[PDB]
């Protein structure tokens, strides 16, 4: 549902 | 607290009012 | 937010989204009170009846957002948490008494047109503004009905007389809570709902033109949004806890 956030944040 | 707190860059800082803040002011019938 | 409107851009620049890493989902609202402290409801982080007990690494905060689902490149900032602090007397067993928590960010967030802290009230601001009839404002990305919004929603609701709050419910109401919302006769409606909790109930001071956070969206019984009211954590009453935590654990 949400847009993929940058993987740096994960 | 923060010296600049609660003053919005796109509203208070430019002296622009949002569409319904006045509804809040109108209710503060200081009583 | 039920029966709200779309927020204007930059209308609530202290609004924070509490975001679950995996799976990617909105947990709750929250608010920015300085460049490294975020305020929310304790039950957003710790609620044993639902097997909720998040650690720092399960969570992100997203600051400066308008759109619920979009990654707002160049606008929003996503921060990791250094430490969660739950009020030591938060009552999850009974009534969510003292439903408040603080989150310290790993690094200070940069303020911008879209990102800016709200004030915490002083005794005198609270005494003057926390009155029946006086309207505050509630914002969040929660459900529109007891489906989901494209953008941040906003609604202004009146604070309600304490006896009316109490007579609306079987839950024991404490001094660390107030309720707000319209009465069935009053012809206007609105309430927070699923996803909105931990977000801010703010009021604009007529004295110094500054927005203050008076409440945190804590709980309700549906969203009846006839004869029911949303309950908010009474922020000034718990401000000494807030200051203790910040003074001790903030740099
Ligand atoms: C978490 S499910 C839910 N249903 N209603 C709410 C709600 C309604 C009003 C407030 Cl003030 C808070 C939560 N939450």
Q: Which CATH number characterizes residue B20's domain? A: 4.10.140.10
Angle made by CA atoms C99, C105, C107, in degrees to the nearest 5: 165
Between CA C63 and CA C76 the distance in angstroms is 5
Angle made by CA atoms C154, C21, C202, in degrees to the nearest 5: 25
DSSP state of C191: B
Angle made by CA atoms C6, C222, B25, in degrees to the nearest 5: 45
Task: Note down the domain range covering C188.
Answer: 1-12+118-236
Kindly give, in sequence order, each residue whose CB lies less than 8 Å from that of residue C232, ignoring residues fewer than 6 positions away: C177, C178, C179, C180, C201, C214, C215, C216, C217, C218
Q: Are the C-beta atoms of C140 and C192 separated by less than 8 Å?
A: yes
Q: Is the CB of C178 under 6 A from ligand 1?
A: no
Q: Is the CB of C231 under 6 A from ligand 1?
A: yes
Between CA C141 and CA C153 the distance in angstroms is 6
Tell which residue, C214, C158, C207, has the closest CA to residue C33: C214
Q: Does A10 touch chain C (CB under 8 A)?
A: yes
**Whether residues C102 and C190 fall in one domain:** no
**Whether residues C45 and C98 fall in one domain:** yes
Domain with residue C63: its CATH number is 2.40.10.10
Which residue from A1, A4, A9 is facing C78, i.e. has the nearest CB? A9
Phi, psi angles (nearest 5°) of residue A2 = -85, 155
- Give the count of domains, chain B: 1
Tell me which chain A residue has its CA closest to the CA of residue C26.
A2
Method: X-ray
**Whether residues C206 and C245 fall in one domain:** no
**Whether residues C175 and C158 fall in one domain:** yes
**Whether residues C122 and C223 fall in one domain:** yes
Within 8 A of C129 by CB-CB distance, chain B residues are 28
**Whether residues C57 and C69 fall in one domain:** yes
Tell which residue, C147, C155, C212, has the closest CA to residue C182: C155
CA distances from C111 to C39, C62, C70 (A): 17, 13, 20
């Amino acid at each position: 549902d949400f847009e993929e956030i940058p993987e740096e944040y994960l | 607290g923060e010296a600049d707190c609660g003053l919005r860059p796109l509203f208070e800082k430019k002296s622009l009012e949002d569409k319904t803040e006045r509804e809040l002011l109108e209710s503060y019938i200081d009583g | 937010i039920v029966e709200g409107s779309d927020a204007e851009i930059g209308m609530s620049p202290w609004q924070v989204m509490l975001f679950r890493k995996s799976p990617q989902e909105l947990l709750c609202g929250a608010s920015l009170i300085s460049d490294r402290w975020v305020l929310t409801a304790a039950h957003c982080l710790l609620y044993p009846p639902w097997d909720k007990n998040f650690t720092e690494n399960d969570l992100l905060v997203r600051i400066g957002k308008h759109s619920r689902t979009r990654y707002e490149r160049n606008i929003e900032k996503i921060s990791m948490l250094e430490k969660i602090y739950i009020h030591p007397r938060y009552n999850w067993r009974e009534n969510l008494d003292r439903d408040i928590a603080l989150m310290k960010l790993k690094k200070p967030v940069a303020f911008s047109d879209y990102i800016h802290p709200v004030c915490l009230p002083d005794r005198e601001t609270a005494a003057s503004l926390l009155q029946a009839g006086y309207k505050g404002r509630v914002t969040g990305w929660g459900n529109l009905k007891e489906g989901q919004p494209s953008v941040l929603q906003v609604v202004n609701l009146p604070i309600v007389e304490r006896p009316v709050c109490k007579d609306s419910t079987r839950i024991r109401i404490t001094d660390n809570m107030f309720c707000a919302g319209y009465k069935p006769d009053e012809g206007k409606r609105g309430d927070a709902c699923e996803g909105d909790s931990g977000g801010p109930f703010v009021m604009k001071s007529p004295f110094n033109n500054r927005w203050y956070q008076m409440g945190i969206v804590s709980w309700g019984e549906g969203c009846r949004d006839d004869g029911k009211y949303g309950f908010y954590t009474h922020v000034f009453r718990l401000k000494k806890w807030i200051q203790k935590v910040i003074d001790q654990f903030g740099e």
